[PDB]
Amino acid sequence: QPSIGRYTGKPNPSTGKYTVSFIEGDGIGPEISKSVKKIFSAANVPIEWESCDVSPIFVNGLTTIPDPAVQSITKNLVALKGPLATPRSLNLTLRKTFGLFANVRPAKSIEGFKTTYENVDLVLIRENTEGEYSGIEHIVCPGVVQSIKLITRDASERVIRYAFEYARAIGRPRVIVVHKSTIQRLADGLFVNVAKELSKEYPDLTLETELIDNSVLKVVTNPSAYTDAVSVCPNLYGDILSDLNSGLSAGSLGLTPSANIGHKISIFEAVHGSAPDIAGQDKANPTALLLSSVMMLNHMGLTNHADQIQNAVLSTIASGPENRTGDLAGTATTSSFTEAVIKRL
Amino acid sequence: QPSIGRYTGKPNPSTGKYTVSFIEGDGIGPEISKSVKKIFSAANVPIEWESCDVSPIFVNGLTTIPDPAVQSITKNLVALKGPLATPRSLNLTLRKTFGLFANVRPAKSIEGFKTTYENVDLVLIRENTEGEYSGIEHIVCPGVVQSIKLITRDASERVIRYAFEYARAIGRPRVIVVHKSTIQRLADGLFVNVAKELSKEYPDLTLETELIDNSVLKVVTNPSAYTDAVSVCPNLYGDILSDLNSGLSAGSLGLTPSANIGHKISIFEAVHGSAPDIAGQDKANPTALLLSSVMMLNHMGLTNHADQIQNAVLSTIASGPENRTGDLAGTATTSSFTEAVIKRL
Amino acid sequence: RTLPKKYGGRFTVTLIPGDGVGKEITDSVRTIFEAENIPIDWETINIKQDHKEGVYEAVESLKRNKIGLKGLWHTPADQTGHGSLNVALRKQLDIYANVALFKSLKGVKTRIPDIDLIVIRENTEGEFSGLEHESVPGVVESLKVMTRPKTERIARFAFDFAKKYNRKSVTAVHKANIMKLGDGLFRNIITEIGQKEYPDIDVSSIIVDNASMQAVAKPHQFDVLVTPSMYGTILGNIGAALIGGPGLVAGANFGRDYAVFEPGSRHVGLDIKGQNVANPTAMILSSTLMLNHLGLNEYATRISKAVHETIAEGKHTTRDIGGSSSTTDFTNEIINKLSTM
Amino acid sequence: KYGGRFTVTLIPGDGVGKEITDSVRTIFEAENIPIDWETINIKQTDHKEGVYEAVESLKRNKIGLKGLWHTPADQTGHGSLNVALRKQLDIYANVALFKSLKGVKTRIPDIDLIVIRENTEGEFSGLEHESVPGVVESLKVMTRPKTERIARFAFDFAKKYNRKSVTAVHKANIMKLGDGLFRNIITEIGQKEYPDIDVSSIIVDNASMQAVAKPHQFDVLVTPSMYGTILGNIGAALIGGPGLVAGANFGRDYAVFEPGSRHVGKGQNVANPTAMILSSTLMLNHLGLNEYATRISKAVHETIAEGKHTTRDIGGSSSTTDFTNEIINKLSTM
């Protein structure tokens, strides 16, 4: 496990159980969180929850995160949030308060589930601090919008460090830095240079650089060619590339886990929406939130429980059409799914 | 003596004479440098010259300073340049290469010489690194030029330190930070905040802040009101203010010394032009360069020679119209002036 | 109706008195005006403790009346041209030309005598339309614009003004030596509009640092100065010092459809804090610029002669020009020369 | 007809560019088309005297056929020639056509999208500076007149080629002002000026996902400079690679035809000339020929449909010359 955003262990002195903030969110949030707890109890894992509320409080018009949740999460060092609907930016303040600088986005095919692309196993780490997130827009002359975007060596030498340590930590040879024409944008020149500087501190790893143009041409014609690699990119192309990857693996954000790594805190979440018009009806698909659990486990050190709840479980239960869910042309229900998983747990 | 840009002493091991780079420059440069040497020899000061050439070499189209002069000045730690004509910017590269971050511009009335303002004794320190010097211009839409200007805490906490240590070093109670409306430009808010932070490390000094508007109103109606104070400002207003101060003291740049202080090196110069159309004719006025010499001496520790060559000398010789020079409605020549100074030297 | 509000011979003009001192000098004008029985009705706007409902009410009043008389706030914002009112006047009413008149007065002891310069500064761009940001900690970045249409307006304004008041010199003040593009544009546009459209007027250029030096040492060489936002405050304050202080400086602000009259220095160094001690001259003289503009100005010549005469005889003069009388005493002396006028 | 002869600018490019260019020159002389090449020798996509000669030739002839440089500059839209065409000629609209071909093994069949990208602003007109060490700042503009042009261009193009959907691709969720402007202008110009055409919007990240998973939902995509390259490369992958993608670049007065993917993905005589030839037929259409365009188009479609003589990138083993000669062969018997 990566030295960069290392988990400071310490189970509960009394219970022998690790404390983990929740944030069940809304829409299909509740019923998906319920399924995670029933599979975490049923597999007997060293974890006691602590549901937080992150409803956007306003302080000086600047969106701030409630102190109840801040204290909870700063203490536990880990959180596992579900979806939440849309009112600054909820997700943007979340990353700013907890110092989350890296976003980890896996995209893997499900064995035994026929999707249009096959044998995809992609990992993409994107920067979260700067770029278009800390961007400024203004009107210069009457019909003219100017954008101002920032990139720094510090923030870059950090996702890139993490990318290296993460490739090592999952046993992958190459880290690929994706960028746009290096000579016509010295912003990508800075990102690439930083990556070459760190190349030497990681001799077990091969550093490749690729034009984002070529990357998308290759990955789409043959996704497997990147299952031995970990890609990093600047904040700019991160949104686009990660969503393209999930389109290769599944055809939607439905089955996609994500990790937001900070220097000490780390939040794990599915990236699909609240989907309110399917709430209560027990049709939700907890696979996404489940797989973020796995990533969370693995970040805590509970490797045995991680593989247990991932290896068999939902991965293998997503085989056989009477399971699945409405989204994956299945017939099962969020309840029937949870225990169908506890079956081969 | 200021700890900020402290002079690393060391006379010549053999001669017992300090080494000092020159750069006589051009136009009336030669004849004005000649006068400085005749007065430095005649007052027996521990200094051997080393005339440098700084003619702008071009390296990658980026104007660079000749290596002969670089090594000379990096070694000597002090230089004393006269005027030089105009071919990116000669003076601008000079300050970049030697790390000169502060410009010290005194403006004092001459005792016994009738000028339109009286009893002015002003000291202005301005930042030299950033501002409009490291500025960028470009065309955004077809009739629209946008300017980009930068100010940093680091460069500010440095002219401001120096301003404090220089006020202590010349026995003045107040340092006045000059700025523009603090609440409608958070650039001046940063400069003022930095000054208040350093205020506490210098308890013997009184920090006042003033709107540049009010400063120019006060200083022009009554110059004397500031002869107990040292003013610092950001690079932006530095040009304008220092030239207004010299308009008060003399009505031109003719009698004005300046110092360019860096972390180790320090260059001293007059701020008037080459004035080629009066070269050779022996009509030049060395007072400006002479007074830079005094500042140089005082920066080196030769206080006794400083006051000698300033206290009596040219200050007192500028009394009596058969001295002076053509510029000060006088009759003397640059030769007759030099020894008229050596007289009371 | 692009015209100043007027019913039956009477103009309605917006009056924005300002703070306490602003109200004192504003009342001086109100008093002289009733005494001279001028056909002006004040629509007075109370901007109570860069308060948002008052700024809205002043803008709305100016939209209706087109002409305004404005006092001071002696907060740092009002004196520099920022603060809610000034930005509203500049963004909503497009008032783009600030004019300050620096004429020496007959009975005021000044180190340099007989000064007569006019400073015209651009009021919608540069300093007044930037963007500033701190994107990495400890680093502040400014992004300011200079555009040709805005600089063409200010050029034509300056030249049209020189024409109207028989001035013979217009000098553009700029920093084109360093800002070769932006301030180059400024110097060029002014000098071109000079040669092609106003040949009877001498155009010239001066770098701003040199102009500062030249202004304190030999002010007589200048006539009309035109400058960007950023240098006009500095030149104006040299101007104010040259003639005996902010209390003597008339001012006006123009847009295409609107005009607002107000002391040209914002009473910068007009401290003299106390009750009834402030010099009302700048407000009164600005008042007469307004009269001229409204087409009155028989009234303006009289009021102007009265105050020049009153300050010429050292009696009843206010404390900042060496007298010892209150603003009220000074006002009453002026009104007194008016009845016998 | 009976006319005279068009002079068109030919800018062959590097070695591969010259191979595929010569494929077109060969097919054209074989079909005896009334076109005279005014061929311009541009050493590099940077060679200052060459770029000046190409611009000057385009000013005279108005129409151009342009090969590739496989430097990273040419493939991204930068480098001296591309900026000259954009700054001096005001060529503002890049069009790429992604049609699936009958005999090419693709994971998703029957694709037919058109990507139209703005070519004078955003990425192509910025300013970048490093003013404090280790900090790079970008200043880009999006303006309403440039986005109105690209809007009308896209809708005018949909109208002319009987396309029924135009989707604006943007990032207005984050860039609420600039990309908001873009989305709004496209949708307004749609409802007021082109009612017979369906307008829609899609955030660019979602469009990426949607393009690799369900390409069929899209028809004509219109995007700013910055997202065009990414969407275009998904497009190229979807139909079997860059060698199959026709392209054109338009200004008001000028048109330059060239492969629409800049051939992102050598050896001697092995490159696929299809993209160049198809772009060549777009040019024929534009010049008003296009009887010739229909024939040449049928020839290459037929040749690639039968797996014989196909070049190595679409599963064949023939050289570019073999492929060209096969096409010319079906032409004479037509």
Swiss-Prot record, chains A, B:
Task: Read off the SUPFAM superfamilies from this record.
Answer: Isocitrate/Isopropylmalate dehydrogenase-like (SSF53659)
What does the entry's cofactor note say about binding and number?
Binds 1 Mg(2+) or Mn(2+) ion per subunit.
Enzyme class, top EC level, equals oxidoreductase
Subcellular location(s) of the protein: Mitochondrion matrix
PROSITE patterns attached to this UniProt entry? IDH_IMDH (PS00470)
What is the protein's major site of localization? mitochondrion
One Pfam family, short name please? Iso_dh
Q: What does this protein do?
A: Performs an essential role in the oxidative function of the citric acid cycle. Also binds RNA; specifically to the 5'-untranslated leaders of mitochondrial mRNAs.
**Similarity comment: family membership:** Belongs to the isocitrate and isopropylmalate dehydrogenases family.
Return the protein name.
Isocitrate dehydrogenase [NAD] subunit 2, mitochondrial
Swiss-Prot record, chain D:
Q: Which Gene Ontology cellular component terms are annotated?
A: cytosol; isocitrate dehydrogenase complex (NAD+); mitochondrial intermembrane space; mitochondrial matrix; mitochondrial nucleoid; mitochondrion
One Pfam family name is Iso_dh
Please list the cofactors this protein needs: Mg(2+); Mn(2+)
GO MF annotation terms:
isocitrate dehydrogenase (NAD+) activity; magnesium ion binding; NAD binding; RNA binding
Q: Which GO terms describe its biological process?
A: glutamate biosynthetic process; isocitrate metabolic process; tricarboxylic acid cycle
Q: Copy out the cofactor comment.
A: Binds 1 Mg(2+) or Mn(2+) ion per subunit.
Query: Where is the site labelled Critical for catalysis?
Result: 171
Anything else known: Present with 10500 molecules/cell in log phase SD medium.
Please state what the protein is called: Isocitrate dehydrogenase [NAD] subunit 1, mitochondrial
* Source organism of this protein record: Saccharomyces cerevisiae (strain ATCC 204508 / S288c)
Q: Which gene encodes it?
A: IDH1
